[PDB]
Design a protein around this ligand. Structure first.
Ligand SMILES: COc1cccc2c(N)ccnc12
Lengths: 543, 542, 532
């Protein structure tokens, strides 16, 4: 059965790769353990906090925390849906602490970031058409969403090498404290939705699961742990500084939008489908019904500022230098076809440049239905983009706009949805646009790193096998757990105990509404700590 | 230089070199892919391939792959293969030496072990060629072209490549494969001549594996985890695994039993296997009979059918349910009709009724004068994955006080037999979860209890798998290099058996799904010690 | 018992080092060989002790003008003809562009960084001499090396020597999909490769270097339509791979259709069907004009069924003007080697065509198509349809349709179709010296390659090394020399086809890649040595 040339080609110490001594491991028994928590409503703005205390003589070690949430049935009228990954967006903060203090904590967004390359984790936290499409209730008793459980993997450093990295409790009490975002963050809804009643009646219903380990004659040794912390820059300020950086493993930079100067209302939302094209199509779809109207004489029901034009016989309406081709089939003899030529329009001066959403269409074809008295659109040529779909409606009607701005029908305006997702990066719903033009990191007062493209994000996505990375400077390339991490290391004497970030943002057109979306600079630092287990668990910052 | 002046600036302790390694020399060996045709036997007269590996120059092996030749399929009717056809072929696999069975597995259990291996699943046969339902129009028409599929037979010997490989100490290994009846892998309609197919079909297998020829092999013993399952009785919420002495893991799930039906179904989506795909195939098969454009009252439907003309406002009220039907370009001599009771079920006369027509809220379309048919544009409905998983015979069983299936004979004859051996839950996606609570008892004591599938969450999480099972894992130690950690019995105290009780969700007797029977499946992973003194042997740890 | 602690471990203090991401600009010379662009980067910093993780970035220019233009998917990898890492002792490692790509083909994120977006890869159309077809863009190419397998452990040590990374770029026509209207002559003149090299450098305090091994791939391409290839001086190989490439030299490299960014088999097929449909069913007032004379365009009968021999095409268009009829083009593409032979007729691969004529746009809007078009059909060069072998005219499409055909010169195509789906190797034989080392009647070696590497684009691969990398000396197939076993010879038998299918005339080339084991030593700087 072997070929003759192999057997013919077949003193030195030789390591055996066909057998190995199956070592007896530490004696232990694992258990999936679940805890109800205690819910308090204080800290801050009466924010909801869950606390779980872990102390059992048979739990010697734990890891792999997973948080459960019961989502209630949602009944009533209006449009309602959950943000994708709803269970993660719920989370404002997680702390693991002993009686000596805090062992490890994370900001909601950073936990989410760390799990973003984990499709399973993401799926478990709630990503489904059931949960994330925008349902509409038609009756005060109609069911919008059914009840549901979501599961949030609270990834910890204790999970890297399973039992080797687990958290050893000894005889100490470990408290896990979870702070929840306000339910407004996790919910997408329209004006008809009675959010006021929903807000009062909604309660967070959490449960903390984990893998406990009952361990005979546990042999503890000291370990190291990376604890993340982040600094949020002042609004639109292109700088932030992290103080007291003594032994850090990595440093990440990114941008968030800030929508406080707005009502957080958006024209459209794609629902469960989350691709860039989904976002764009959802937006086109919402505009199409005011964009091309089939009507008995001039269309009614629009603001006087609307400029609705009858389409010439050759199908071309000319909006300044923009040509829009409109051919609708099966149009009644008493009716004509109209193009709305300024459905949304923005400018900071009269008689200057204009951002006009209607000029972003070049062809609209479709067929009229006599049966349902509507136009069924077939093919659209346009240049709508992910930004357009990310513009809050408030910006269209702002005092900086010389135009009325929002010339949609009332019916369309009613369909607008509030979106308060807490984990948005960049300035568009997909973090597609790169608004950072240059990044500088200084250790003390000396330049540590500088780049003119996102070469650090490319390396981040590569080394972590992620397609949603960040501009990240990684200092630790040493394998976790089995080594002490490599860290950038302070002088303190020479002033080098702080990392300072300066980015150059690219500047947008002041006549595009996107210019007025506020930006925030997020800098996340991972500091090395030593873990000791001598009478209670404790950590110690490495200097 | 290019190294910034800060990194250079801040640069006698005992250190590990992370910038070089000692290249230690491995065992001198040489690998080879080997294929074998083996021998076939047919003794319910199930086919059994057996392959003997006897060669003094093969020290070890792993990575078994079984290939199967699928023959050309000629004739009339509708015919496709079940997704991942290769795995559904396999009833049982066993690896034995002269000293008995070294490792064996049920077909469904090997499928489950491979379910997160996309490549393995794709090689086994997942393609529109294989899995879309084709239709033959003449007795000499070709329905399916000859294909060859490859089934990766995952074994404990692959976990750590050469370290885990099954060693052969001059012993004769026999790999024995038991095949499900070909009924199980074929989705067909009534017009297909399955009788002739069933007798003409022959499983044509070849077993390949990676053999290793090793000089001066140095054998050591290892351990192996051998799966075992129990199936509770029909509709019992309990099942028990006896003789549990050293288990590494326990998993619980549910299968449906359709033995009380014909295993015929109204619709099937073919190669496209998403939940939305199943639903859409179903809505599509119903729509032919649901909304009819006709010259006077539509004909060819049973008398029990309630087909009514759509009023000029487009709304038909089926009891409390309002259906909107508006069709464009309908001829002046024709009207739009709606079948208000396409499928309907009830257990007591003039009481509660489940009526599939009521799960439509809006149906829009345009009549084609050129093809004499209605082309539908938008359907608002509430059909779900369960509706698509109902055997037709349940619509027409004696419990139904109605006729039940009010479809056209044209619709009825397109129904399909599905006999997939590996269905789970009570719907084709395994979406619906009918376990409301699960209890595992080691003896009289409760070992585990959960109120939601947190055990499946961990299973999926810890194995990176989208389709896990409610699984209790006892071993968190790395395989091969460590004696697996087990849960250990106490025979003295009756603690040598694992009993599982679940609380099934309570369903409505006026929904056909209520009558789909279910079985509890409990799989236990028993720890065995593999010994190599005079041949290969295994011993169940006690 | 004596038990190993699985609940805690000693934290070893590692070598003291600091890593830095380092980007460099290169020297570009358009010398070597056919005036091919070369980019040289010199790493000569005394404080860069080790490096790995090479990333090449490319600034792609704005593209202005007229016509249809797009970039091949994963454009950055397709740009690379060859990468070579060398030192003042010669070459340490080097790879051919296709093999680098092959090595990265299951690294989705690497592929995405290289340029795989609708911005890049859909075919765009410029409407005026100053219309912008593509915006400027920067892509990132992960030059994977043996030095990244085990991070700092596997890293390239510089040892106070001067490292030079050399990148040879394919001509830009390889990465561009264009029509005839696009001014490629000008573009070809003005386009310049604008490359920057990044890498992770390591400042190591008191580095303790040791020797190691390294697999260096090398390949042999057979002559056109010759089913054999030999690799010489094979003394210590860790693997051997066999695949097939098409040769399109007998050809203008033009194809009827291309799907764009969407790259699924079904996308290729639908893009094709859409292109044929404009000529396949025609709503016309009187017999359609503008077609070649060899075209057999017939009016669809009232029954709706047109019969092309034993092939029936059902065609119903809705809402057709009273003064026009519906026609079917019964031989849009046809191929036969004799007058009394089997004919391959693309119209016969359609069974049903429905749609609706639009009065407003005066064009037919197709609704549903029953057809049997396959991936091969879409991968047939137009030339082969009109080759001398074809006793028919071949291409009976409209002139408007033929204007839209696209040049494609992607250097990394394999097999004979655009998804490498069809296997054309029927039998495979591998000989070490004169003795058969391996043979197979089915693609079991490729099934294993896909299985063992978790890949759906594998190759027929003989793996000799099943030993963990870096931490052990790799297991190799080992020469004898005295018994003539210093040669790896591959012979394939290609599967046979009916000679009346155009794809039979696609020229094939056999590709054999051998991974030879090298020893890395660090005496007078870095040095590699071929194991014998
Ligand atoms: C998966 O097994 C391994 C991976 C990496 C390192 C080691 C090691 N140090 C000892 C034993 N096994 C190892």
């Amino acid at each position: 059965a072997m070929n003759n040339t192999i057997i013919n080609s077949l003193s030195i110490k030789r390591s055996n790769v066909f057998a190995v001594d199956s070592q007896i491991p530490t004696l232990y028994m694992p258990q999936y353990i679940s805890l109800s928590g205690v819910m308090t409503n204080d800290g801050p703005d009466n924010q909801a906090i869950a606390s779980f205390e872990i102390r059992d003589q048979y739990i010697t070690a734990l890891n792999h925390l997973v948080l459960s949430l019961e989502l209630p049935e949602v009944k009533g009228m209006g449009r309602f849906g959950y943000v994708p990954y709803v269970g993660y967006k719920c989370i404002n903060h997680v702390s693991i602490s002993s009686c000596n203090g805090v062992i490890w904590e994370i900001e909601g967004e950073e936990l989410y970031n760390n799990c973003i390359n984990n499709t399973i984790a993401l799926k478990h936290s709630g990503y489904s058409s059931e949960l994330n499409d925008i349902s509409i209730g038609l009756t005060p008793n109609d069911t919008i969403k059914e009840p549901s459980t979501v599961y949030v993997y609270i990834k910890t450093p204790f999970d890297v090498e399973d039992t080797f990295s687990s958290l050893k409790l000894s005889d100490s009490k470990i408290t896990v404290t979870v702070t929840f975002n306000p339910v407004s963050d996790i919910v997408i809804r329209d004006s008809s939705f009675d959010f006021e009643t929903f807000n009062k009646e909604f309660v967070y219903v959490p449960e903390l699961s984990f893998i406990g380990y009952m361990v005979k004659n546990v042999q503890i040794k000291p370990s190291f742990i990376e604890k993340p912390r982040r600094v949020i820059g002042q609004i639109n300020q292109p700088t932030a500084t992290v103080t007291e950086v003594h032994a850090a493993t990595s440093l990440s930079v990114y941008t968030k939008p800030y929508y406080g100067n707005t009502d957080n209302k958006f024209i459209s939302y794609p629902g469960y489908s989350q691709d860039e094209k989904d976002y764009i199509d959802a937006y086109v779809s919402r505009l199409l019904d005011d964009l091309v109207i089939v009507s008995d004489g001039p269309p009614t029901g629009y603001p006087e500022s609307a400029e609705i034009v009858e389409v010439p016989e050759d199908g071309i309406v000319s909006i300044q230098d923009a040509d829009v081709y409109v051919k609708i089939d099966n149009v009644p003899d008493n009716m004509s076809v109209y193009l709305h030529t300024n459905l949304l329009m923005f400018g900071t001066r009269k008689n200057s440049f204009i951002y006009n959403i209607s000029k972003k269409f070049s062809a609209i074809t479709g067929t009229y239905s006599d049966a349902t008295k509507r136009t069924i659109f077939a093919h659209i040529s346009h240049s709508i983009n992910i930004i357009d779909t990310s513009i809050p409606v408030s910006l269209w009607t702002s005092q900086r706009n010389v135009y009325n701005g929002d010339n949609r029908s009332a019916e369309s305006k009613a369909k607008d949805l509030f979106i308060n997702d807490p984990f948005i990066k960049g300035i568009d719903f997909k973090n597609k646009t790169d608004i950072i033009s240059r990044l500088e990191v200084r250790f003390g007062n000396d330049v540590l790193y500088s780049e003119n493209g996102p070469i650090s994000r490319i390396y981040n996505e590569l080394l972590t096998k992620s397609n949603n990375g960040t501009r990240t400077l990684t200092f630790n390339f040493t394998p976790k757990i089995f080594f002490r991490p490599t860290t950038i290391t302070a002088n303190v004497s020479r002033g080098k105990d702080k990392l300072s970030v300066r980015v150059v943002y690219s500047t947008m057109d002041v006549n595009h509404p996107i210019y007025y979306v506020q930006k925030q600079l997020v800098v996340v630092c991972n500091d090395l700590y030593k873990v000791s287990y001598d009478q209670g668990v404790s950590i110690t910052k490495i200097m």
